[PDB]
Every structure is written in C-alpha cells, then in structure tokens.
Amino acid sequence: EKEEAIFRSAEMALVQFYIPQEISRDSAYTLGQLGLVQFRDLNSKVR
Amino acid sequence: SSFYTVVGVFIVVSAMSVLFWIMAPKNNQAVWRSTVILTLAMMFLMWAITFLCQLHPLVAPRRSDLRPE
Amino acid sequence: PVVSTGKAWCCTVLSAFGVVILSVIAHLFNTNHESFVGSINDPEDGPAVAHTVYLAALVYLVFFVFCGFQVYLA
C-alpha cells in the first residue's frame, strides 16, 4: 500500500486545517506526536 | 583465444539480469532491482577489460634473475 | 596486570594475525614456490628458513594465549 519513494520522491499534498480555539492547544500535540506534517508560514510579512 | 568468450559470458549475464527483473521481491523492490543488476554489470565489465589486453599481447615479460630450476 | 582494555586487545589482535600470516609464509617457504624462492637475490636454503618463521609463529601463539587470558579476568 505504502509506496517506496527511493527511485523518485514521495508524492506530497497540501492540507488545510480549520482548528477551533478551544481545541487549538490540544490538536497541536496530536499533530506533534505524529511527526509527519510540515507546516508553512502563513503569517509572513508580520513582525 | 576466442573473443567470442566475452560475448558468450555477456549473453549469460544479460540473461541472468533480465531473469532477476521479474524475480525481485516486492518489499524493497527497487533496491533489489538496482543493486543486484548494476553490480553484475560492473563485475562483468571489469572482467571483460581484464580478459582482453591479454588476448593478443604486444609485450612479453623478461625476468632477468630467475633461478634455472 | 596490564591496562587490559586498550593494551590487551592491541596485543591479542596483533598476535591473532601473527599466527595466521606467518604460518602460511612458512608453509610457502617449506615448499618451493618460485615467488618466495625464485630469484638470484633471495634466500637459498628453502625449508631451512621455514623453521625460523615457524618459531615466530609459535612465539606469537604464546603471546596470543598469554594476553587472551588477561582479558578473561573480567
């Protein structure tokens, strides 16, 4: 089922998360305990 | 002798390489299929370059000391 | 004893490769081989110089069993 990705690269996908504030501090641990999401910076050009 | 020795060994190794493309295991499939086939190629090419240049040599050894026994 | 961590292993490995290599060198001096005895500037007597290499193989075997027990203390 799971591909090999040693001849070429693995196939990626961009995923959008709508997270409520009351479970925002909770779901961050769930996405940290599984280490397979690379977040990208949406608040660029903000000091 | 026989330059056709190299061609015969080439036919045997190129038959054993195509036979392993359809016999490699499914789990680490591209690692078996590229390590095993491409080491037969380089192991063949080094033997073929070493077996040639001794097929029809231009230079003979001398060995000036060589005890007569 | 000795330091027995960096000084016993450094002698047991050297003595383990001292028995194996000198034995086959003495064997290839025992039978005439044309690579060990084949030159006019080369040892002549043949299997007489196998004796003085075989004794060094035995000396390295003595060092091997003497330093192999000194790591067996722990």
UniProtKB/Swiss-Prot annotation, chain A:
It is found in: Vacuole membrane. Glycosylated. Present with 55714 molecules/cell in log phase SD medium. V-ATPase is a heteromultimeric enzyme composed of a peripheral catalytic V1 complex (components A to H) attached to an integral membrane V0 proton pore complex (components: a, c, c', c'', d, e, f and VOA1). Belongs to the V-ATPase 116 kDa subunit family. Subunit of the V0 complex of vacuolar(H+)-ATPase (V-ATPase), a multisubunit enzyme composed of a peripheral complex (V1) that hydrolyzes ATP and a membrane integral complex (V0) that translocates protons. V-ATPase is responsible for acidifying and maintaining the pH of intracellular compartments. Is present only in vacuolar V-ATPase complexes; enzymes containing this subunit have a 4-fold higher ratio of proton transport to ATP hydrolysis than complexes containing the Golgi/endosomal isoform and undergo reversible dissociation of V1 and V0 in response to glucose depletion. This is V-type proton ATPase subunit a, vacuolar isoform. The gene is VPH1. The chain holds residues 3 to 49 of 840 of the full protein.
UniProtKB/Swiss-Prot annotation, chain B:
It is a multi-pass membrane protein. It comes from the Eukaryota. Keywords: Hydrogen ion transport, Ion transport, Membrane, Transmembrane, Transmembrane helix, Transport, Vacuole. GO terms for cellular component: fungal-type vacuole membrane; Golgi membrane; proton-transporting V-type ATPase complex; vacuolar proton-transporting V-type ATPase complex; vacuolar proton-transporting V-type ATPase, V0 domain. Residues 24-34 are cytoplasmic. It is found in: Vacuole membrane. Its main location: membrane. Coiled coil: none annotated. GO terms for molecular function: ATPase-coupled ion transmembrane transporter activity; proton-transporting ATPase activity, rotational mechanism. The chain crosses the membrane at residues 3-23, 35-55. Belongs to the V-ATPase e1/e2 subunit family. V-ATPase is a heteromultimeric enzyme composed of a peripheral catalytic V1 complex (components A to H) attached to an integral membrane V0 proton pore complex (components: a, c, c', c'', d, e, f and VOA1). This is V-type proton ATPase subunit e. The lineage of its organism: Eukaryota, Fungi, Dikarya, Ascomycota, Saccharomycotina.
Curated annotation (Swiss-Prot), chain C:
PANTHER family: RIBONUCLEASE KAPPA. V-ATPase is a heteromultimeric enzyme composed of a peripheral catalytic V1 complex (components A to H) attached to an integral membrane V0 proton pore complex (components: a, c, c', c'', d, e, f and VOA1). It is found in: Endoplasmic reticulum membrane; Vacuole membrane. Accessory component of the V0 complex of vacuolar(H+)-ATPase (V-ATPase), a multisubunit enzyme composed of a peripheral complex (V1) that hydrolyzes ATP and a membrane integral complex (V0) that translocates protons. V-ATPase is responsible for acidifying and maintaining the pH of intracellular compartments. The chain crosses the membrane at residues 9-29, 53-73. GO terms for biological process: endosomal lumen acidification; Golgi lumen acidification; proton transmembrane transport; vacuolar acidification. Residues 30-52 are cytoplasmic. Residues 1-8 are lumenal. Keywords: Endoplasmic reticulum, Membrane, Transmembrane, Transmembrane helix, Vacuole. Its main location: endoplasmic reticulum. InterPro entries: Ribonucl_Kappa (IPR056552), RNase_K (IPR026770). GO terms for molecular function: proton-transporting ATPase activity, rotational mechanism; RNA endonuclease activity. It is a multi-pass membrane protein. GO terms for cellular component: endoplasmic reticulum membrane; fungal-type vacuole membrane; Golgi membrane; proton-transporting V-type ATPase complex; vacuolar proton-transporting V-type ATPase complex; vacuolar proton-transporting V-type ATPase, V0 domain. It comes from the Eukaryota. This is V-type proton ATPase subunit f.
